[model samples]
Target: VLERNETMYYGGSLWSPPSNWNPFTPWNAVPGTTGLVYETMFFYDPLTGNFDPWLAEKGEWLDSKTYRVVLREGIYWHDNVPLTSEDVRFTFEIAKKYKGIHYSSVWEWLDHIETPDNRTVIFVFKDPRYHEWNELLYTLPIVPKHIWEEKDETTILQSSNEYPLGSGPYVAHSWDQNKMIFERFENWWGTKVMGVKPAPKYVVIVRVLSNNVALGMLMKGELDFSNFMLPGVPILKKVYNLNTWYDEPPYHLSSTVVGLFLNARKYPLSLPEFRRAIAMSINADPIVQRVYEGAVLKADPLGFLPNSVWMKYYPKEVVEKHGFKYDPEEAKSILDKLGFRDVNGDGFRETPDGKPIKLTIECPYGWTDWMQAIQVIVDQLKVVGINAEPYFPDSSKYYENMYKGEFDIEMNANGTGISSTPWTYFNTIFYPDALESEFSYTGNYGRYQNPEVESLLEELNRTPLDNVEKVTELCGKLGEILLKDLPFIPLWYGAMAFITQDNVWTNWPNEHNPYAWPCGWANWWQTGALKILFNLKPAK
Candidate 1:
């Protein structure tokens, strides 16, 4: 057995040591650091739609327009400054002024914050929406007033806070080009307030650019946790004495939806019938089996996460009426009806005006699975008389080009709210407001616009939180629009394929003990991660 060392080594490719550690800026802070360093008022349980109090002792609505928050007693910042309503108010004020990408949506509807006392903060909304409540209370990270109050807005937005101070359990200890190390704060308030203490005394995150390197480290027992998928799992499990959430096919379903993002601004792609034709041509079953090794489930037509409870929103009748199945003949018929034909005696089809139709589908070079999947997609499209090619660019270049809407087609994952529900997910995908600005990082890269769907999203936002039936109905209507438009073609749900060694640490959540989110990458920073860390123990 491995000897106990109060240190846990995590390996993942999601984040490198960021140049700027400011949480307010877009793409500045490290991926897993924000939730570890800053605490939100409440932690939302996506599985059950319940809010667990963290920094706040209680959060309740006084009325439809007003919400009350009672601060946790005896909580102190890293500098021993008492946490109160002042910090909460200051955080919101800065967020409104800076208009950060993640939290700015919440500030749009917030009228004012009322701090009646040191321990109490009240939110008074103008035309309060149920969705905004989740955004305001559960999403925004609270920063200390004393540390951030004096910083200029520009500096706050740009500065690389190398030694950031936080009230959370871990502090920014040290970081270099290749890795970041976090040391546990002995005086963490959660130990006293919530009767919880983390198992590991130190946490180290090493940046491995290649997934193969990370996997090798995991097999050698040098790494404790990894977020990337392991190839030849059956052999690796026996050889390395490792464990995942599952021991079978369709290992675990992720909260996010993987999709083929077609740019509607491009010609032919803008046509809904053409987009539907493309969707109907490609089969998902073969892709799932070949690319993922049958470790993930095929996504729904609406692109809602297959594993989430929100799948109930996608009605069976709507799916049967409008959903695109793998029927290459039907795809050909649709194209023929739309006046696309091979007039030049070439196998490839062309537009009505006889213009050549050659589309390029791209993903990053290092993304092995996506690259392989795109190759399969290109082959399938070719068989249906469509000239499609796969382009693998450098990862950074690919993202830059993707944001600029430079590609004919690309692959992307679900943006946000995959953990909780589909309301935010659908809104982000279909909302047209982001199209007003070129290359806006609003998750609507496809630039799909529909006035009716936009109006439905607004209505859904206004519906009360308790009215689940109404929300479901709104989502069903939205699903119909998605099925018809085909803005984003649903591909498959990725597995939360986390690999861990059982010799060093025990009590990792498994099928029988599904206490926390199975994905270690998310578990490092999310609220579920906190629970998992507290529950873990040194193996005997």
Candidate 2:
């Protein structure tokens, strides 16, 4: 009998390994397999996008430009060290200087983080922002600076090589190149909050390649938990049907949209009609079913917002108004009006210069299914004289190609958690300053810049939801502008599925919130192999 299994094991994706596991380090360590972990805060809950007090006792805005976080009393790090306001101030100061991955979205408004006492922390922002708490409180991971202040600043960020002490349920016991070992923190304080006791004694992560290999090892009882990507669909389906697996579609902070990023600065695509025609040419629904194995949902017909609450008003009216109805004839009409013609009489349309309106689409390796989908899209576009050729390479190389703006189209996915709202999602990627911000957030891959769009996104970010009617109107208008501009072709929204052996507990949480809240990504952190072990019964 198998103890556990992890599908498609990942070895190196975490920011920093265990070395300086302090959250304040460049890359903080998250809990891995084998032990319990406690989170002080959640990103977003299903109830609302508002920040909830977890490790915090209470939080409030001092004014329009500042927020204060009051820490719960009696909290201690795993090393029995008391957690204090000093840690929060230290972390924020370091974050301000280094600007971590999420810095661009949150740090811009921050003026300074001050600690008034051991239990009180204050954050002063440069402007009066409505979403300040949501951006700063939830996404900010608290780390112990006592462990890190002793080390050189240069070597601190890369300190995952050895497990640093953590306040969570587990601590690193050992780590070799191929494997990581964890031991449960016996004295953890947050276990009661999570309603879990008798935590696993040890957790081990063995590195493996490919989902297929990981699945094989899992079935053979070599591993216990894994987050497989899309390619594992077929095997999971077989397992579920054969009554050999447990299954659930856990909501994730992830997005899968195959976009045809147009270089508005460089090509004919800069023309709005040309872009709209291209958007009208390719069909996203069929691509979802055929290539993605029906594992994705259609994105809002006009933008990237998933059809969820924070986005309910945003998508409903936009789809009703400018929905991308699949009308090949209408697409042709638009193209004809734009002066495009099938001059070569080659059954496909072409520009006046007789050169095919060709686009080079770059696809990453390990995502061949997406490549196939793009090929189908290319075939569709050919009917309208727009030709797209496939460009494939290893995943890293594909990103390299994108960095150079070396191609006209690229198939990519963005990782969003429950804390992410529609405004942040699109703006982070398409906003003008995204690529060149002081933090170098780098999402505007098409080098797209539009003053009108930028202004609308800023309004979306700073505006309060209390002004619901106004916000809805603004978002609807913004959606119209996006559809008319067509900076990128909207593709399918992705979905995630998890599988376990059938006799496992079937009562998994189903109602998940839509916004990518800070605590959103780790919602399933409690559902690993150890949870199964605790619920397991002795053999007959």
Candidate 3:
């Protein structure tokens, strides 16, 4: 029987784990893959949906508009420099130039950042922002400046940066082309805390291909634990027995929606009635049942908002307010009313403007499986006289083309955090200015934008965190607006499944939103590494 007292977690894909562990220098780490490499000031407690001080001793708003943070003293970088506020300030300064996919907004809002003393850090906001305070205080990772400030911005993506000075529980011991070693922090600051103690003597991250190989490692007692989202229901049933299942409630919706995006500014789709017709014709129930094997939930019109209590604020009435229910007969009637007909008596409807209502939906290549699901959607759309073609581009070039608003329709995913507010998700990705890269979340690839969305998002960002109800209400309004516009059709939320051996017991915290890595890891820290060891006993 495998009898080591050390427990490890395993599972999943690694697209872009950070080579540079420095948090303040560049936002390069993938949340699930490399987030544990660094520590953040505060972490979300799944039970409360609030930030509990992790590295910070005390964190509070100094003013209604500004937050002050005091870090735990005596913490050292992996290289052993005393971690101080200068490191914090320097990290932020460098991040301003190279913020990649995550946390770029922190730099964009800089009025000024101050180091009041070695352990204290104060953020002076350019404007009043309530959520920004929680977001900044809890979400941003602090980096050791002495090591990262000297590197060229472009070169940070290389291996040297991948193992920079970090203050987390583990430090990089060694690494090669395929694996890296991490040793527990000898003087980890957490040990000095009143109730919290440091855990883990060592941590190792190995790179392997395929779930089968990882499973093999787990079965042989070669791995402690793993996290992953696999392909099917039966497969998941078997994996749930391997260790404790991580059950954090989803903060943001998973991205399995096969949506029809309408560019309202473009011709044909600009007509409100046509947009409504397409929305009404969506056969959500049949699609969810047939394609997902009845394993999916019908969207709550707000898309992925139904997965949590916070989503309760987004009411069903508001979501279905337009009464855009599924009705094939009514869909036909709406097309007929629009003066479309079988021009060639071919039985397929044609536009009055002498064109066929054809649309090409684009997807990235490796998602051939998802595209096959799209083909199922295409078959259904055909009944409504809408000709939808599936188009695949090389996966590497997919986002480049998407950022330019290159497709009429596409398949994609969105990662929402445990906070579950729609403002950041909706505004940053869908607002006109953001879509046009005017302000930079730059994800609204279909270019679906409006002035109202911008105003709502601005209000959300500027609102303070204490006003939870107000923020929740504003998010609901944002959802209402998007539903009315039908900028993108709602599809089912993606459920994550894992495959593991029968001996493990994983408790997925609701706050970490079990579908992804970063959330799970933060909660995992609280569980402590030893709990993982206690649960895994080898085959007799």
Candidate 4:
């Protein structure tokens, strides 16, 4: 009765109808438009630093400022033209040609690219930022030199390449209002080069109006995978063979850490004793237990993800020496020692100088989970004799106040992700006490500043990106400072909603067998998600 036996159905990454198929303008293109169709020069696993050769046989650093890549043979574009190093050279040069292309500012360090022959391409950098360059290798999807060369600037930037010619495992077949299709490219180079062929003959990503409707389709075996999370997975797992990354509580493994951003420039919040007390008082379990239904992992003392590979950077001795736990008496003791007393006996501790303390914890109104988390934190704050109110403002005002450093206590997710090193987290959480007039857009929302933290950050930045030993040592030092200072109270990991249906597709990535993460995003080529596609099998 199941007719889509040879096809894989995906949902939750695309919301609107398909319009732009341009790989250059990735922001608006349909998910997998570039990733599944156009392949990258190299394959990298940002999670574990698994940088392997894909289109290119191998790439190497020729000198301090120069790098070279050798293209693989027998590779052909969908049009049957041989793929050469010139194509790889053009992908980066085109960014220079059109300044607005995503990450075009990469040209600042990228002096020029030279394709010496059909197989060899060389890159010369003004100064090699190995971290950024490593990411660019897998993220910048290569294009056919012949096809893209003839196209003008307007066509390259704005117009769609109606029928794209790519060298990846899948090629765009058809995309309409209801469904988008990618026909398997049988001549995919991976089969001959890497000895791998994706199981599905067709990948059909469907559009559903809502998550509830998507869940119904998954129940009916109409959907093989959903990148979006569906609530009550535990109950559904009993009825159907529905599965998440984890079988028990904290249903998904998290790479993102979320926490409270206390305004350090504010009165009592500026004190390290006050910050440490708040961190020790508010229990993070309820956030993981009640709000997420035990679907999210709690964060560590330094706000790094729990049970993560990044934990290796923070040694046990340092954490044990500096870490503070949830002890109500300890929190109260610290407050009393600091002279933060109930000045008027209103069941709330005031400033050490005996002033009224009314701190409002704020987030946007529609963020239900965060609002619930805020309420739990507020209740804990009250238990510790701190007058805290849960407040919700419009999204626009909430962001403006955060950037302006105008809020008392605001909720913010940590900027670190599943990167090769913990430098990403440390670099993001620290900023110059003397900062940009308007403040940073990406990191340090509370205008938090410390000379030691900033110095450690500068040292980490200067450390060679590939030097993990030094990087880890530097990060360990930073974590110690962060733990001692309590610049931000670490709470829990952000929820990643990667759920899949086994009715149609199986061998999906889970806790034990994690070949790759499966998510339908525009940049699947950059992530291990497409590797999930290669390993997926139609359930028999």
TM-score of each: 0.93, 0.76, 0.77, 0.74
lDDT of each: 0.76, 0.56, 0.56, 0.77
lDDT of 3 by residue, 1-540 (tens): 122433344434332232544343332333222335566677654334555676687887777657778988777666767888887787577767666424556656667788879998888777865654555555566766777667775665453454546766666666544444555566665555534432334445545544456656765655544544333444444543343234332212232334556655555666667777777766666656655555545665566545443454554566666536777778789888998776876566778887776777776654434566677767766788777788877543555555556666666553233342455456434656545463222356567757687777778777664577777677667777777777777666654333345443343322333322222332233222322322334333
Whose lDDT is higher: candidate 3's or candidate 4's? 4
**Candidate 3's TM-score:** 0.77
Give all candidate RMSDs, comma-separated.
2.6, 5.5, 5.4, 5.3
* Count of steric clashes across candidates, in order: 0, 24, 31, 0
**Candidate closest to the true structure, highest TM-score:** 1
Q: Which stretches of candidate 3 lie over 4 Å from their true place?
A: 1-9, 15-34, 95-110, 150-160, 171-228, 231-275, 315-317, 336-352, 356-358, 362-369, 391-395, 438-442, 465-469, 502-540
Q: For residue 247, give model 1's deviation from the true position in Å.
A: 2.9
* lDDT computed for candidate 4: 0.77
Residues 380-481, candidate 1: write the lDDT tens digits: 999888999899886666767666778898887736435555677777678677677665555677788787987888788888756778878888888888
Could you tell me which 10 consecutive residues in candidate 1 have the lowest summed lDDT?
518-527
lDDT of 3 at 191: 51
Query: Candidate 1, which segments miss by more than 4 Å at Cα?
Result: 1-4, 13-17, 100-102, 343-346, 520-524
What is candidate 1's local distance difference test score?
Answer: 0.76
